[PDB]
């Protein structure tokens, strides 16, 4: 429309209907100029990369993108508490995105003094990739998200992708995507962008624990009509052999028969938060569970969802099998254990095996009069018909969704890190501010113009998601566990701003408090 | 229309129908000032031109022009591969040109 | 119908539509007499078969069957090249089979 | 339909309407089995081929084809005489083809005695290639045509084609055509085949001579108002120079100006039918006009249509520039000059240059006081705007049409040998008798069956063409030249059967007798 009329209002509210939530958010963003309007073929050989497992090849683009898919973007700590205390499950339904109130600024730096001026005729060009024809970055949980606190202004991250490689060289199947080669919408100040998206049907994330375990499904009062082999030995002494059977019953459980078995396991190494209980050596990389693909060892981060620890022992956690979050202002490298936030997976102890323990035990050999019965340990168990498991839990800081890779087959395509796997997730929104060149020379030259005006843009994003809720039906008598702010006095308020104006989330908040029967 | 409204969107796609292709392209251009707004009667005698086969006479204008008539302008290497592998012949039918989002 | 009228024409072509291919093929076959019109209870003990992993038991019939399910039956090397270069995926939809011009 | 009912009647007549002729023909054919049902990759290296110009690579097929495109197939000597005496031009309009009364025979050769028996269930499969997707053989004037005399039974020639090569090896662009890979129609005894074809518009072949030459177009009574340079020399002696001009007139023709010039020329070597007048040497290959393509010298047979000889000198003919026909029962190789039939092109002397003579003469240099005027000979002249020529003449023994190769450009695509060039000539009719295998072995074998029944088929072909005529409008007074049978007595009748039953055409019959004004 025009320069003096606003493109859109700030709408941050969230409305709770019965079966449905609609959470609107609005932020202020700032978009710089990336790579000086170039595509630079990034590879490991540019800097270091002396290990084959770290080899990569790809391209970096001047474009930048919006990643809103962490949970803290769309939920306040109170709207999250209201969510997870009152509801068994949820899932997204619709998505609506808006760009408005765009402003483009010119910067002139001369004699070290710099003047920022406003370009009314400049454009910024933005498109959504609806057909998934570009490498999908978002589902990888990289930084650059809409800040959790609505008053922050955030930079838009740079877009770039990786392709096939042999070492640092490019293999003939490598693809190159020119992002200028897509239809986009060019926006001046007084233009606004929007689009709508409908999530494909995804199973409700289960926010509950289980009020009974998998190995106790039974009436403790009554016997089973099925037997087991209780006694293989008549008595002590030679040639004493007999087969005695016994009714499996409350006196001896864990020998009863049962219809279902716990989920699969891939063992992780156990490491204790107490320092002295750990070994003295470097076991971090060497002693870690990995998966190798095409000669590259990819360390196995968050694998099959598994209980992090057993019973009341919290001292230890799986090496790579847990999510680790940083606190506010946490360093980049060699951070002490107190500044990281380690996540606790113990809610699934009922249906899932412990991550650091063997799935079970199997017989190695056939016994005989000569040969003793020998049993080995099962470190990993892929699946068995009749297994039952649960997915890894959802947090405020964790990702909302991921993209299920397009492939011939996949089993239970729920993201190993967390969230809602989708064949067609909400599309990427890429944004770039169009180049404005400096004065061309008078005489014509074949070469392309490498001199541009230093420039950046600013605006607001509105992202509203419509969520579908599954209400608690529980007939339980005694009171539930809930998520609370502990009342004791403190220098600061949790999930509130600091004295310097810094917003910090004290602890990771899981989704699982309410319980259901197994 | 106005200063704060864009004159046109960026449309670079190409659509392959059965008997027909439509290749759209969009570029960014920069136009300087030529000859200080003059017509200067260029000729070989201005610089060198000591051979009769190289003799020429003409005029240079402040104007400038769009030349899009190489093939790489309208086709990506993939749209060219798709073209020449699957097809015996081709020829242009229509042309459509646009200037928009002008800035001085 | 009759002895002097042909039962069917030879139709070997293949037609490429946009989303769909129809590949017709035609061959000439010869059917002998098998097992002298008998069912003979074939087993490993007939010849050799001294390994338990190679043990087998079954029956051989005078009947014979048409196996067309390799790909080279339905596609020429050119129709295969045209297929795999231009297309991401495929799958069969319908099948139609004919026997004609029988001679004993 | 059935075994005991005929598939079609014999229809050989020809009906002359005013502007139109319809010539029906019917013949009896016999189709053997070719290559034992195989495709054999014929190449020069199979036998001999020690010269690079003779290098070839191709495939031979079991299929066979109908070539009816000589003129004697469709015209009797009387229907040809009636045609060329009464008409200025003609051209084909429609074509209609029929196969009927098919018979398939089994042959058993045992102890040297052989019994031919009839297979009622066998088929013969025939298709026309309408889309020109196969190499087009017909336009090359090879043998195998429907016999000129309706009472003869003829064998169907074998089909085969050539592709690219380097020497005898195959270049990657070489193509292989499986003829089984086309839809065809399978015919038993009691089935019949037919199709119709419409000739695309072709210019009338001109059957006429010219009653006036190209260099006499003029009123012999009247002068021209244009001058020429008559005298460059004042008189004998030094420093005598002047420019005198003169009216071009009847006294001095051949110096007059004129609006048009004769057609192009590519010189041929002159060789005399009288033996002693020729040189003593081998000039046949060495002294012959050729055209080289990709390192191969292709001798230039029938090139631009050009008068074979000048004036009343028939002793000589161009080396390769004339059509040579054989007489009846003529040998294959090293045939004496009397048994060949040499064709006479002299009817075009008016509009065309002599084949054995230079097109003209051009100045080599600039004259001056020092330098004399020097002129060289033009051996070949490609074209000039304002040239006028005529095409080579049509005969009874010569081809009716050809196929204009599909290419970016062609100039005046009239076949150099003769006839009507067409982008889409009448399609090839290929025919094969389907294989009937001998008894298969009892035990299954992977290999293909190489044992077949010796077999052949027989039937009748009807080919009717509809011709369009251009009638003589001439206002000439004195009588025309016509084609006649000379009356003098002879042991045999021309264009009639011998005492042994052999049909022989005595002389080639051109199409050009009637005259028109130039």
TrEMBL record, chains B, C:
It is found in: Virion. Belongs to the parvoviridae capsid protein family. This is Capsid protein VP1. It comes from Adeno-associated virus 9. The gene is cap. The chain holds residues 219 to 322 of 736 of the full protein.
């Amino acid at each position: 429309d025009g320069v003096g009329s606003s493109s859109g209002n700030w709408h941050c509210d969230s409305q709770w209907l019965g079966d449905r939530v609609i959470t609107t958010s609005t932020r202020t963003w700032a978009l710089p100029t990336y790579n000086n309007h170039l595509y630079k073929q990034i590879s490991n050989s540019t800097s270091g990369g002396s290990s084959n497992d770290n080899a990569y090849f790809g391209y970096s683009t001047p474009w930048g993108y919006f990643d809103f898919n962490r949970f803290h973007c769309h939920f306040s700590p109170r709207d999250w508490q209201r969510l997870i205390n009152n509801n068994w499950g949820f899932r997204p339904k619709r998505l609506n995105f808006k760009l408005f109130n765009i402003q483009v600024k010119e910067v002139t730096d001369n004699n070290g003094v710099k003047t920022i001026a406003n370009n009314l005729t400049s454009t910024v060009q933005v498109f959504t990739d609806s057909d998934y024809q570009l490498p999908y970055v978002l589902g990888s949980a990289h930084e650059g998200c809409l800040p959790p606190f609505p008053a922050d202004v955030f930079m838009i991250p740079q877009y770039g992708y990786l392709t096939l490689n042999d070492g640092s060289q490019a293999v003939g199947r490598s693809s190159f995507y020119c992002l200028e080669y897509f239809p986009s919408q060019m926006l001046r100040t007084g233009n606004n962008f929007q689009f709508s998206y409908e999530f494909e049907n995804v199973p409700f994330h289960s926010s509950y624990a289980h009020s009974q375990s998998l190995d106790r499904l039974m009436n403790p009062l009554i016997d089973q009509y099925l037997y087991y082999l209780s006694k293989t030995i008549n008595g002590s002494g030679q040639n004493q052999q007999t087969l005695k059977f016994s009714v499996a019953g409350p006196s001896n459980m864990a020998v009863q028969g049962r219809n279902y078995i716990p989920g699969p396991s891939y063992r992780q190494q156990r490491v204790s938060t107490t320092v002295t209980q750990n070994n003295n050596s470097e076991f971090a990389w060497p002693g870690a569970s990995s998966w190798a693909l095409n000669g590259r060892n990819s360390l196995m981060n968050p694998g099959p969802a598994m209980a992090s620890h057993k019973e009341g022992e919290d001292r230890f956690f799986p090496l790579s099998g847990s999510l680790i979050f940083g606190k506010q202002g946490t360093g980049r490298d060699n951070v002490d254990a107190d500044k990281v936030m380690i996540t606790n997976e113990e809610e699934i102890k009922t249906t899932n095996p412990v991550a650091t323990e063997s799935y079970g035990q199997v017989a190695t050999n056939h016994q005989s009069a000569q040969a003793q019965a020998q049993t080995g340990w099962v470190q990993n168990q892929g699946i068995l018909p009749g297994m039952v498991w649960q997915d890894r839990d959802v947090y405020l800081q964790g990702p909302i969704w991921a993209k299920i890779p397009h492939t011939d087959g996949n089993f239970h395509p729920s993201p190993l890190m967390g969230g809602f796997g989708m064949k067609h997730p909400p599309p990427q929104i890429l944004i770039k501010n169009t180049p404005v060149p400096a004065d061309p020379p008078t005489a014509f030259n074949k070469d392309k113009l490498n001199s541009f005006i230093t420039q950046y843009s600013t605006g607001q994003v509105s992202v509203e998601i419509e969520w579908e809720l599954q209400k608690e039906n529980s007939k339980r008598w005694n009171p539930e566990i809930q998520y609370t702010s502990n009342y004791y006095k403190s220098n600061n308020v949790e999930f509130a701003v600091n004295t310097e104006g810094v917003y910090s989330e004290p602890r990771p908040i899981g989704t699982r408090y309410l319980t259901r029967n197994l």
